[PDB]
Structure formats: C-alpha cells, structure tokens
C-alpha cells in the first residue's frame, strides 16, 4: 500500500469532511414561559416532560 495525500483549505459547505463543529447544543427558556411551544401530554405536562 503506497499513497500520497495532498491537503487543501475548504469549508463545511464544500464538504462535510471539513466542519470542526460536530454536534452543537442549543436551548433557551427551558421552562416554557414564552410559550413558543405547546407541550404534548396525557395528564400532567410537568411530570411527563423531562426537566
């Protein structure tokens, strides 16, 4: 097995093989106060929905 690699710049747009991110957490207002969501539930939202 004989190779020879050549590296170049580039970004994640051009190809996934670039981006240094790899998963990124994002959350806001964990306690739905702004009500930008309507929680699903069977009886009690607070208890059925993981804090």
> Which residues contribute to the site for another protein (CB under 8 A)?
1-10, 12-17, 19-28, 36-40, 48-50
**Cβ of residue 31: shortest distance to another protein, in angstroms?**
12
8 A C-beta contact, residue 45 and residue 38: no
Give the C-alpha separation, 22 to 41, whole Å: 32
**Cβ of residue 21: shortest distance to another protein, in angstroms?**
6
**Cβ of residue 33: shortest distance to another protein, in angstroms?**
12
Q: How far is CA 4 from the centre of its chain?
A: 35
């Amino acid at each position: 097995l004989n190779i020879r690699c050549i590296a170049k710049k580039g970004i994640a747009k051009e190809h996934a093989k670039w981006s240094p991110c790899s998963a990124i957490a994002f959350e806001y207002d964990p306690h739905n106060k702004l009500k930008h969501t309507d929680f699903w539930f069977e009886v009690d939202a607070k208890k059925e929905w993981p804090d």
